[PDB]
Amino acid sequence: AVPSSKEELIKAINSNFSLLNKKLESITPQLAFEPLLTTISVANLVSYLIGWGELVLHWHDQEAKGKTIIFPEEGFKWNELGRLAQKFYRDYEDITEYEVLLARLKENKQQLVALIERFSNDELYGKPWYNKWTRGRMIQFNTASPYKNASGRLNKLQKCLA
Amino acid sequence: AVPSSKEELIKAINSNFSLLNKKLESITPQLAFEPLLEGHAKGTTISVANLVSYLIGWGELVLHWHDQEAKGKTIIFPEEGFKWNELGRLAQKFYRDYEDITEYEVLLARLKENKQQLVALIERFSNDELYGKPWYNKWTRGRMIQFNTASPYKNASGRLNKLQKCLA
DNA sequence: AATTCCCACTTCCAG
DNA sequence: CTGGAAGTGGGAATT
């Protein structure tokens, strides 16, 4: 089902992260930076996940400080999401130890979950936030959804052996 | 069931519009612009005003289809820039298309004027042209019109019934 | 979502 | 067996 309450949103994020997390440590630090996925790496993909997660936190930073949010990101438009994926790859290009990469994804995920707990259910799925899209729906678009999508491309990859 | 003739199509439109319009008129203008409703697309919140905008967008789109046909120009289905799996994305366009209409009475007039043009248009087609042969893919012209006039009218009545149970 | 896409989940021969 | 085409069936589509 599509998440439609605060409780549902949290549980989707936890579950999709769990499974994706398990598939991610299943990769060795050596394979993770090779190009196996117009082809990228697990490292590239996890940076894409951190870029989006960081960005969602950034939106709420901006919002908290009374500042107008620039969606999706400054210098980008919603039809350019692959170009925003290029920026994310580079943003974390110099994190060369897989172990730190996964640790940074995991703590980002934790912050997002903490951010959601901070809002009421009306704040997440009752009111409109970005045009008609609710705050919770927006958060799911760029967290729980790409977790699933990412874990997909992963289990396909593990089917390369041997 | 589904209208099968020019006569049925025109009556189902006038009925479902008359019904829907009764519920729409029994909603305060102040309330009608409040965001309250889960929208056509999951994870959105919309007003009763957006609900009407959705109908106006679909009806004018239907008139636009025919305007294209009347000039001998190729129709783009469902609309320029949207594939058929992007109807959620189109509903949003329809909200924005009419959001500068801030007076509820003007907006229901726009829906009323739109519905009159739609039946006036059905009036100029024979039954054969409406239900006699396919017009787009396998559907008949009448089906395509009913599916975006009569049906969404009734659908909007449904949501208004459910909301009428609470009145704050 | 009329359709469209994208998964997960099969068959079922080729190997 | 055994990937792995290739075809199905259900659910979501979004920003």
Give me A93's structure tokens: 């290009």
Q: Is B76 helix (H, G, I), strand (E, B) or coil?
A: coil
Documented resolution in Å = 2.4
Q: Is B38 helix (H, G, I), strand (E, B) or coil?
A: strand
Q: Is B98 helix (H, G, I), strand (E, B) or coil?
A: coil
DSSP string, B126-144: -HIIIIISEEETTEEHHHH
Distance CA B61, CA B148 (A): 9
Relative orientation angle of helices A42-64 and A144-158, to the nearest 10 degrees: 170
Whole-angstrom CA distances from A42 to A24, A106, A111, B40 are 8, 15, 22, 36
- Residues in chain A, total: 162
DSSP string, B44-73: BEE-HHHHHHHHHHHHHHHHHHHHHHHTTP
Count A/B contacts: CB-CB distance under 8 Å.
34
Which nucleotide lies at the shortest CA–C1' distance from B86? D13
Give chain A's largest Cα–Cα span: 54
Distance CA B86, CA B81 (A): 9
Which of B42, B45, B96 lies closest to A128 in CB terms? B45
Residue type, B24: L
Any B CB within 8 A of A147 CB: no
Give chain A's domain count.
Answer: 1
Query: What residue in A sits closest to B39 (Cα-Cα)?
Result: A132
Phi, psi of B9 (to 5 degrees): -55, -45
Q: Which domain holds residue B39?
A: 1-168
What is the β-pairing status of strands B134-136 and B45-46?
A: unpaired
Distance CA B119, CA B139 (A): 19
DSSP string, chain A: ----SHHHHHHHHHHHHHHHHHHHHTS-TTGGGS-------HHHHHHHHHHHHHHHHHHHHHHHTTPPP-SS-TT--GGGHHHHHHHHHHHTTT---HHHHHHHHHHHHHHHHHHHHTS-HIIIIIS--BTTB-HHHHHHHTTHHHHHHHHHHHHHHHTT--
Give me the CA A17–C1' C15 separation in Å, rounded. 38
Give bridge partners of residue B139 from the DSSP assignment. Answer: B136
